[PDB]
Amino acid sequence: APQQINDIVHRTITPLIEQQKIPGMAVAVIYQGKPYYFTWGYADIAKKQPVTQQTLFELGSVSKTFTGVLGGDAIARGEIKLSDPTTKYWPELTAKQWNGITLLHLATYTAGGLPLQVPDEVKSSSDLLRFYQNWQPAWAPGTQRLYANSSIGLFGALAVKPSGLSFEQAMQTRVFQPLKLNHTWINVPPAEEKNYAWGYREGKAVHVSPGALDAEAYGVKSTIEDMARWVQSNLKPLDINEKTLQQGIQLAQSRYWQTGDMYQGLGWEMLDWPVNPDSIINGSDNKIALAARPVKAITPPTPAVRASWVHKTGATGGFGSYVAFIPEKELGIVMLANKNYPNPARVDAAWQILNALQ
Numbered sequence: 001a002p003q004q005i006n007d008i009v010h011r012t013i014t015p016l017i018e019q020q021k022i023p024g025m026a027v028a029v030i031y032q033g034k035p036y037y038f039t040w041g042y043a044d045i046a047k048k049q050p051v052t053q054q055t056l057f058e059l060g061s062v063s064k065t066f067t068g069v070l071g072g073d074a075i076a077r078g079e080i081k082l083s084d085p086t087t088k089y090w091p092e093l094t095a096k097q098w099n100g101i102t103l104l105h106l107a108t109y110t111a112g113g114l115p116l117q118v119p120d121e122v123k124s125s126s127d128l129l130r131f132y133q134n135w136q137p138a139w140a141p142g143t144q145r146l147y148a149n150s151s152i153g154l155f156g157a158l159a160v161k162p163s164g165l166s167f168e169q170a171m172q173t174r175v176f177q178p179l180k181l182n183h184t185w186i187n188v189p190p191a192e193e194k195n196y197a198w199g200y201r202e203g204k205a206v207h208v209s210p211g212a213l214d215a216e217a218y219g220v221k222s223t224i225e226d227m228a229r230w231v232q233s234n235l236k237p238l239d240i241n242e243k244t245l246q247q248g249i250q251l252a253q254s255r256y257w258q259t260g261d262m263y264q265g266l267g268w269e270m271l272d273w274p275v276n277p278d279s280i281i282n283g284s285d286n287k288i289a290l291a292a293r294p295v296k297a298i299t300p301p302t303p304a305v306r307a308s309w310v311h312k313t314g315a316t317g318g319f320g321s322y323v324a325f326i327p328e329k330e331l332g333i334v335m336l337a338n339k340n341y342p343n344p345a346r347v348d349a350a351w352q353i354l355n356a357l358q
């Protein structure tokens, strides 16, 4: 690889791993459209299995970027509209608080205070109906953003209804397969089990547990190679031959709401480039990122801006991931780790790397 890339990546990542006691890590840098890969440490400590370019990591909430684009693809196919009432796709949802709550609000966490997590107790379809029926908003729709798996999770489930496909089948057929993400999974198959890293939390080996609307909100597993290709695809959607997928990617980076200096897309979050690093670094802290904040409506939404820092953080109990890119600069990064280490450390390292290559 170019020495510049080698040196910035290693000088930033080595101390990060040391400081954060990360068992295993994979990093991709996309530089002028081409990926460069780096790996450290262990996918499985006990069995002495190293992290490779084929190792699967739990993306956690980075999954929301796939959900957003899949929703975008459905919009482009004419199957749904973000302006549609939630009730259009869920006729059993009769409770009056849902009047005025649209697919846009679900997708962008602005329904009025849907909770971060679907309760563990919610198992069945009848349980889920009861949960959403009984949910009482703190705020009018389209006034406050509160990051929520229960929000974008429901969006994901409803966006695929008109197709008649399950969420997983829809994602496989319409996103993963066209983009040749052949080692990206909602459910890891037996054939790939040898490559599936353990997550580590408080020293114990852990994998994500099943939960309602998990696929839609936090359930994707992927390799560093497929994630680099995912970044390439979002960096440069005009290279994508499938027209509805191309438009869907573009819609996911449209700017729907603004809070502080961030803009909410479908899954993706964006800021103008050049960014104030302090703002993205400090803003990634879950203190801020999980806080209820007032939003300004962008009416109508701004199309995907090339001069953006586009990103998403995501975690599970045992994994920590970050993806960021700058379309204008054909520059991007993917950082996958099998420890949930603090968001700001992720973003700081990503900033340092991309800033040096920009």
Ligand SMILES: O=C(O)C[C@@H](Cc1cccc2ccccc12)N1C(=O)c2ccc(C(=O)O)cc2C1=O
Pocket (backbone or CB within 6 Å): 060, 061, 062, 116, 117, 149, 207, 208, 209, 218, 286, 313, 314, 315, 316, 317, 318
């Ligand atoms: O960083 C993210 O991607 C979002 C966070 C949001 C979240 C969900 C549940 C409990 C949490 C506790 C502290 C902080 C965030 C939490 N998140 C999740 O969204 C999430 C889903 C599943 C698991 C699991 O290991 O079963 C863990 C998490 C998880 O930490």
